[PDB]
Design a protein around this ligand. Structure first.
Ligand SMILES: CCCCCCCCCCCCCCCCCC(=O)OC[C@H](COP(=O)([O-])OCC[N+](C)(C)C)OC(=O)CCCCCCCCCCCCCCCCC
Ligand SMILES: CCCCCCCCCCCCCCCCCC(=O)OC[C@H](COP(=O)(O)OCCN)OC(=O)CCCCCCCCCCCCCCCCC
Ligand SMILES: CCCCCCCCCCCCCCCCCC(=O)OC[C@H](COP(=O)(O)OCCN)OC(=O)CCCCCCCCCCCCCCCCC
Ligand SMILES: CCCCCCCCCCCCCCCCCC(=O)OC[C@H](COP(=O)(O)OCCN)OC(=O)CCCCCCCCCCCCCCCCC
Ligand SMILES: CCCCCCCCCCCCCCCCCC(=O)OC[C@H](COP(=O)(O)OCCN)OC(=O)CCCCCCCCCCCCCCCCC
Ligand SMILES: CCCCCCCCCCCCCCCCCC(=O)OC[C@H](COP(=O)(O)OCCN)OC(=O)CCCCCCCCCCCCCCCCC
Ligand SMILES: CCCCCCCCCCCCCCCCCC(=O)OC[C@H](COP(=O)(O)OCCN)OC(=O)CCCCCCCCCCCCCCCCC
Ligand SMILES: CCCCCCCCCCCCCCCCCC(=O)OC[C@H](COP(=O)(O)OCCN)OC(=O)CCCCCCCCCCCCCCCCC
Ligand SMILES: COC(=O)C1=C(C)NC(C)=C([N+](=O)[O-])[C@H]1c1ccccc1C(F)(F)F
Ligand SMILES: [Ca+2]
Lengths: 169, 819, 233
């Protein structure tokens, strides 16, 4: 567990967990992009579009955005499993696949932004308001957390004529 | 006389470097009344000391055998201009040999007269290698005169001066492709002269690829072997508050208090982000002001630099040039860290040793600037239309023809323009020779010096085609010779500070640890494992990688394009899941190559279904199939070792790359301050793509000037004539008041500074590897020891420590160097 | 040719022991004279010129003459074998970057600002004709009477673009030499958008030009040093 209980990696998985909660709130908060035609303002989200002035109501209307976000969440609950079973039975190596999963999570979530971004270009004003910055920060959190955890799990660049990756401890 | 002929030399060299175009008549006479005084003082000095010394034992010095020549040649023109042999520029020869007496400055420096003791064996002994470079240029000029000789018969009025028509003009056109300056436009004329980008046409690119890829190579064997086997022998002959958490916390605040300075809009007087970063400025000054009196509570060059920065950042909580002096907010981090200061003194001690080579290169540039002033004094004027040759003629309006069409004309006022980089005084001459020294824009000065007519007359097409000599001797003797001996000076002052083979090998044998192989149990899975480690399987995977790459280059502009992508995705998925089964996910995730393969496999799988999700009812996700090419370098050990020994040294010295990063930050901020309100307009080099409006654009402009793009035209794109941005705040009437002349110091310095730091980072990384680079691959070394580790871990699959006495048969499996 | 005949007669039928032809820098002169005679006789059969372009190998004969030049020329070839891995790495890195650019910018730089109802490219005095984007994120046309439409060969008369593998591997090599790389960068910026493309070029210059130049200065300087120390003894 020498790489499984380091402080520099425990802080990274802490940042990973913060990214997880920000991504879990960015997928359900359908109030992350406002439209301003001008007194019928609509709040966008990956699932439900709402209207406000009186007549408060959300509905649906680009399946790509929500589907890809679901893919990202699937990567999250695929990666956290292998992450937690890395603490038992000397299974430290498992920290490497988990990290990569998290990385891809971010990537998928990232393109979600893009596609929704593109949708915002087809419709009035626009102001990414509440959970858009949440997702923009969740992407960076998950992406850099995955990358940093991956490098902290991979042993080290040899740096000596005798050292080598894939050594005997 | 050790300080009495120094004065005569100085008063001669200061009168020789005060001539300029349009000098007043009294200076014209003072340089004629004094030109003979400082010659008579030289003949009495070659007299009143020769008699006291001798007449046969005085010519023995190659030093003093030249001091007589200056007088023997000077006495000519005094009693030669009293002749009817006026010869307007024939007297310019007698004037260009007058500055030949500028070499007396070299004599008065022991180093300046000892460095050449081996340089006389540098060029003169190895002028045979400098001859083969010329024999190469002459072959490629004759091949150019065949390929593109007289084929530039274009039906437009566009001018193309770098062509292959005669020999003196093909030599110039090859030298320029060799110095890699604007060579990409000499290729587009060669490609358009044939057909265009057709099939035959584009194959003339080879001529311009072999001439640069194998012409520079020889150039790295000519002017480098001259400066590392001969600048080494010269040196051989010369031989014979106190808690750590507070520091770790406040060091994170100068970074933040710097990033709050950088990402600040410079244009608008009152912007939304301007006041927020002012609030953060005061909120960070209110924190840094507690660390100083604390440093003065526990107590009473490096400890005093934290004070003036807050002093000149809080006074206001002219008026702007102090904000330029607050860009050193991150310059107070050199004391909090260790290596950040341990590198600064190594760059300040690396300058003292290289101080001698930067003094002879400034006198050589000042000697070549005087020649330029005599040759091209005032000849660099021109008119709007090339048909008017004097300033009385170049007045009124004239027609310009768009598209060279005689029936589509525009009226333009004609004006007597003066080239930006000229040779009127010695300062402007030194500026122009500088921009030629960095190889930027030197052909546009060449083809303007070739066309120079007279002292106040416009150019004449191909008037003096011999002037190229001046621009080809200066470029060989400074940009090719002095620059490489300076790099060699750095590389040999770095090489001193760094048996030996026996010591390395015993250290290796002392600190080695074997390799885990994880050969598996359970023969039912051992049969799967044997088929994925056999050489045939690895070579099949290599072949599959190359076939996928060749399948990736087939695509063009204007399906069978994705069925093979899915085929390869599934094949590389299967060779991963089967390898997992063969390693049981405990040995698979050990080898980093397998982690990389896993990453790429799942990435390509995500892309192959991300496209199908869209096509059922993210461009970068397709890059994961391209990156499969890197995984084939896990077999080429000869490339892997080189890459590793250089990435190993690029990571063990980050505190020198942090120097370049801090330099870029400082200069980006100062640039955003000084010239950041210049408007954006096409036709200038300050446009929507290259400007100082934001911070990333300033850093990109600086990275552009670093690689050496047309930085000399940005330097002129911001120099007190410019139109300030509309949305900026200014006074009425002051539109064409933007940009400052301080730019001349902003760029000229930056380049020079960045020329040093980079070289710094380039030699450290090299000297750090001086054991690998200089290693005879035939005798003995750690590659054989890695072979030993391999064959040992073969009989010792798991780590297991040391192994049983007999299985010794591995010594039967070792080859001579260890036998 | 009489000299070559005289030499081949002074040694064997033609070689007879590998004498004249395997004499090092003497097969080259026979090759030169033989193609020269071939072009001369092929002149008087049609009464083209890619065969008289072999007339430029004559200045190599001087190298065959002075043996000191043969010694020098064989030193700059003894140092090019250790540079095999640097070359094998540069070729593969260019091959990778060409494919990346070919996948990302394949056919974007084909619209530009023509004059309305004309086939005349609308630019300003010192500007080069650069791409455009309409209903897009690239740059918009702002000339007075101009409109953005496609069917335009390319930036440098059609020589700089990532369309097939050839033109992409060419415009990658042109940026690897740090010549006019900003021009390619600005054209891609004008075509597709301003924020992403720099990652492709700013990196291609770091790993491509600078890193490779470091490797080359390391392997050469090491080679010169190992030549000097393994010979001064
Ligand atoms: C043999 C060894 C050789 C090793 C050399 C290999 C080194 C790897 C080279 C890096 C490849 C370059 C990265 C992709 C460049 C992005 C392209 C772009 O900006 O615009 C195209 C396009 C932009 O054009 P677009 O029009 O498709 O944009 C989409 C906008 N709409 C939807 C409206 C059309 O970018 C994309 O589409 C997606 C990419 C966005 C950002 C991608 C960056 C991801 C993070 C960087 C990856 C890692 C970089 C390298 C890290 C260090 C490497 C040493
Ligand atoms: C993130 C993905 C993981 C990175 C890729 C893993 C590649 C790797 O681990 O190679 C290690 C290599 C040095 O390894 P080795 O040859 O064993 O060194 C001992 C010799 N004294 O070190 C090297 O870098 C060798 C060259 C490979 C460069 C890596 C580029 C691929 C990553 C993109
Ligand atoms: C010297 C030793 C190498 C000499 C080999 C080069 C000679 C071969 C070129 C032949 C040639 O250019 O002509 C054939 C063809 C027609 O040319 P042309 O008629 O002028 O134009 C088209 C008209 N229908 O040409 C074409 O139309 C298409 C373009 C021809 C392709 C040009 C090939 C240039 C390659 C240069 C290689 C030399 C560089 C390295 C030299 C090493 C140093 C000695
Ligand atoms: C020292 C002063 C001697 C320079 C003589 C001279 O006039 O330089 C001109 C020369 C090119 O010839 P140029 O005179 O421009 O031809 C037209 C006019 N006759 O261009 C030059 O020679 C300028 C460079 C002179 C060489 C300086 C020292 C030579 C270093 C290596 C040889
Ligand atoms: C900082 C003070 C120290 C001064 C020099 C110290 C010695 C450094 C050696 C420098 C020598 C380089 C030669 C280049 C000469 C510069 C050109 C010049 O002298 O002209 C001044 C220029 C005016 O030129 P002009 O085109 O006529 O302008 C018209 C309207 N003003 O308008 C100008 O004002 C240009 C001023 C030039 C700026 C000089 C600053 C040099 C920066 C380098 C400092 C560090 C050096 C790095 C070396 C370390 C590693 C190599
Ligand atoms: C001692 C050092 C020795 C120096 C080394 C010299 C290098 C030799 C250069 C080899 C060039 C090979 C060119 C052969 C290509 C075959 C011609 C062809 O058929 O391709 C045409 C190509 C694309 O097809 P195109 O005709 O444009 O499409 C129109 C519609 N059909 O259209 C094209 O544009 C083809 C042009 C491709 C050119 C690619 C250039 C990149 C290669 C340079 C990287 C090498 C770096 C070397 C570093 C080593 C360091 C020492
Ligand atoms: C080293 C220096 C030389 C290397 C550069 C080679 C130059 C050739 C580049 C490819 C080429 O010449 O043309 C591109 C070709 C399709 O081009 P296009 O003419 O549009 O399509 C034909 C339609 N009938 O597309 C192709 O067929 C090229 C396929 C080759 C794939 C290269 C990857 C191999 C990996 C090693
Ligand atoms: C190996 C040998 C050599 C190694 C030595 C190491 C030295 C390395 C020095 C190289 C530095 C290269 C810096 C290139 C980054 C430039 C970023 C850029 O050009 O992006 C432009 C883009 C424009 O966007 P904007 O300006 O907002 O306007 C458009 C809005 N619609 O902007 C954007 O849209 C995104 C902006 C965010 C990009 C930030 C990432 C980099 C920015 C600066 C990085 C460095 C910071 C400090 C400087 C250090 C650099 C040395
Ligand atoms: C005025 O400066 C100079 O003469 C220099 C010129 C002419 N141009 C460039 C680009 C320089 N540089 O720093 O790379 C220096 C130069 C050049 C040859 C050797 C040494 C230096 C040195 F001055 F930098 F040391
Ligand atoms: Ca250039």
């Amino acid at each position: 567990m020498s790489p499984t209980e380091a402080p520099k990696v425990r802080v990274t998985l802490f940042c990973i967990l913060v990214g997880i909660v920000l991504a879990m709130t960015a997928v359900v908060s359908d109030h992350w992009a406002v439209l301003s035609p001008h007194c019928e303002a609509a709040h966008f989200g990956l699932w439900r579009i709402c209207t406000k002035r009186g007549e408060k109501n959300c509905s649906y209307f680009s399946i790509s955005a929500a589907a890809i976000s679901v893919f990202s969440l699937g990567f999250l609950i695929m990666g956290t499993i292998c992450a937690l079973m890395a603490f038992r039975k000397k299974r430290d190596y498992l920290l490497r696949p988990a990290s990569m999963f998290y990385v891809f999570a971010g990537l998928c979530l990232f393109v979600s932004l893009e596609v929704m971004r593109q949708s915002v270009k087809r419709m009035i004003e626009y102001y990414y308001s509440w959970s858009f910055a949440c997702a923009c920060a969740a992407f960076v959190l998950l992406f850099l957390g995955g990358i940093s955890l991956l490098l902290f799990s991979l042993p080290r660049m040899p740096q000596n004529p005798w050292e080598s990756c894939m050594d005997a401890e | 006389f050790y300080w009495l002929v120094i004065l005569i030399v100085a008063l001669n060299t200061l009168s020789i470097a005060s001539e300029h175009h349009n000098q007043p008549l009294w200076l014209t006479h003072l340089q004629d009344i004094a030109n003979r005084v400082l010659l008579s003082l030289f003949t009495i000095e070659m007299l009143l000391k020769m008699y006291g010394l001798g007449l046969r034992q005085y010519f023995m010095s190659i030093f003093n055998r030249f001091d007589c020549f200056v007088v023997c040649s000077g006495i000519l023109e005094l009693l030669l201009v009293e002749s009817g042999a006026m010869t307007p520029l024939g007297i310019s020869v007698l004037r260009c040999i007058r500055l030949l007496r500028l070499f007396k400055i070299t004599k008065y420096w022991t180093s300046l007269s000892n460095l050449v003791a081996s340089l006389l064996n540098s060029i003169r002994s190895i002028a045979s290698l400098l001859l083969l470079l010329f024999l190469f240029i002459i072959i490629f000029a004759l091949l150019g005169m065949q390929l593109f000789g007289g084929r530039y018969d274009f039906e437009d009025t566009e001018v193309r001066r770098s062509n292959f028509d005669n020999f003196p003009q093909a030599l110039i056109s090859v030298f320029q492709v060799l110095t890699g300056e604007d060579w990409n436009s000499v290729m587009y004329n060669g490609i358009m002269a044939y057909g265009g980008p057709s099939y035959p046409g584009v194959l003339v690119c080879i001529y311009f690829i072999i001439l640069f890829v194998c012409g520079n190579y020889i150039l790295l064997n000519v002017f480098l072997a001259i400066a590392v086997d001969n600048l080494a022998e010269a040196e051989s002959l010369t031989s014979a508050v106190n808690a750590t958490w507070f520091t770790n916390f406040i060091l994170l605040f100068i970074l933040l208090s710097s990033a709050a300075l950088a990402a600040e809009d410079p244009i608008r007087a009152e912007s939304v982000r301007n006041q927020i970063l002012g609030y953060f400025d005061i909120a960070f000054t209110s924190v840094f002001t507690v660390e100083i009196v604390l440093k003065m509570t526990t107590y009473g060059y490096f400890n005093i630099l934290d004070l003036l920065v807050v002093a000149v950042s809080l006074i206001s909580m002219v008026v702007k040039i102090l904000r330029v002096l607050r860009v050193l907010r991150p310059l107070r981090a050199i004391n909090r860290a260790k290596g950040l200061k341990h590198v600064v003194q190594c760059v300040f001690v690396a300058i003292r040793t290289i101080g001698n080579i930067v003094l002879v290169t400034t006198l050589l540039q000042f000697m070549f600037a005087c020649i330029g002033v005599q040759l091209f004094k005032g000849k660099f004027f021109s008119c709007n239309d090339l048909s008017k040759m004097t300033e009385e003629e170049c007045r009124g309006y004239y027609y310009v023809y768009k598209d060279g069409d005689p029936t589509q004309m525009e009226l333009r006022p004609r004006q007597w323009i003066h080239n930006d980089f000229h040779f009127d005084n010695v300062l402007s001459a030194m500026m122009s020779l500088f921009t030629v020294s960095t190889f930027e824009g030197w052909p546009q000065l060449l083809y303007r010096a070739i066309d120079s007519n007279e002292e106040d007359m416009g150019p004449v097409y191909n008037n003096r085609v011999e002037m190229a000599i001046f621009f080809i001797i200066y470029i060989i003797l400074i940009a090719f010779f002095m620059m490489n001996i300076f790099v060699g000076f750095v590389i040999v002052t770095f090489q001193e500070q760094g048996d030996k083979n026996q010591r390395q090998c015993v250290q290796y044998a002392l600190k080695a640890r074997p390799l885990r192989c994880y050969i598996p149990k359970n023969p039912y899975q051992y049969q799967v494992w044997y088929v994925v480690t056999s050489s045939y399987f690895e070579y099949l995977m290599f072949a599959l990688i190359m076939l996928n790459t060749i399948c990736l280059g087939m695509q063009h502009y204007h399906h069978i394009s994705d069925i093979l992508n899915v085929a390869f995705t599934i094949i590389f998925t299967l060779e991963m899941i089967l390898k997992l089964l063969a390693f049981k996910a405990r040995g698979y995730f050990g080898d980093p190559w397998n982690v990389f393969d896993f990453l790429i496999v799942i990435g390509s799988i995500i892309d192959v279904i991300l496209s199908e999700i869209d096509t059922f009812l993210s461009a970068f996700f397709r890059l994961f199939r391209v990156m499969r090419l890197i995984k084939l370098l896990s077999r080429a050990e000869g490339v892997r070792t080189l890459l590793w020994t250089f990435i190993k040294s690029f990571q063990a010295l980050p505190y020198v790359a942090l120097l370049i990063v801090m330099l870029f930050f400082i200069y980006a901020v100062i640039g955003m301050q000084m010239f950041g309100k210049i408007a954006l307009v096409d036709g200038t080099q300050i446009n929507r793509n290259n400007n100082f409006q934001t911070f990333p654009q300033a850093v990109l402009l600086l990275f552009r000037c670093a690689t050496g793009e047309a930085w000399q035209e940005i330097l002129l794109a911001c120099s007190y004539g410019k139109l300030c941005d509309p949305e900026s705040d200014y006074a009425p009437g002051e539109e064409y008041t933007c940009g400052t002349n301080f730019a001349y110091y902003y760029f000229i310095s930056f380049y020079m500074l960045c020329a040093f730091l980079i070289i710094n980072l380039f030699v450290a990384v090299i000297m750090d590897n001086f054991d690998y680079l200089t290693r005879d691959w035939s005798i003995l070394g750690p590659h054989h020891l890695d072979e030993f580790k391999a064959i040992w871990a073969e009989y010792d699959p798991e780590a297991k420590g040391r192994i049983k006495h007999l299985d010794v048969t591995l010594l039967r499996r070792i080859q001579p160097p260890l036998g | 040719s009489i000299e070559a005949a005289m030499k081949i007669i002074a040694y064997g039928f033609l070689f007879h022991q590998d004498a004249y032809l395997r004499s090092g820098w003497n097969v080259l002169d026979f090759i030169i004279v033989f193609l020269g005679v071939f072009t001369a006789i092929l002149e008087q059969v049609n009464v083209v010129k890619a065969l008289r372009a072999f007339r430029v190998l004559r200045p190599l004969r001087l190298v065959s003459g002075v043996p000191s030049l043969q010694v020098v020329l064989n030193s700059i070839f003894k140092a090019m074998l250790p540079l095999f891995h640097i070359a094998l790495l540069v070729l593969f890195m260019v091959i990778i970057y060409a494919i990346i650019g070919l996948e990302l910018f394949k056919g974007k730089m084909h619209k530009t600002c023509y004059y309305i109802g004309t086939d005349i490219v609308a630019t300003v005095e010192n500007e080069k004709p650069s791409p455009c984007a309409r209903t897009g994120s690239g740059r918009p046309c702002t000339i007075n009477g101009s409109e953005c439409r496609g069917g335009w060969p390319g930036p440098n008369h059609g020589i700089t673009h990532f369309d097939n593998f050839g033109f992409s591997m060419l415009t990658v090599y042109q940026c690897i030499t740090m010549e006019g790389w900003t021009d390619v960068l600005y054209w891609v910026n004008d075509a597709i958008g301003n924020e992403w493309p720099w990652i492709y070029f700013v990196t291609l210059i770091l790993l491509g030009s600078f890193f490779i130049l470091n490797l080359v200065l390391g392997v050469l300087s090491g080679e010169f040093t190992k030549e000097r120390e393994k010979a001064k003894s």
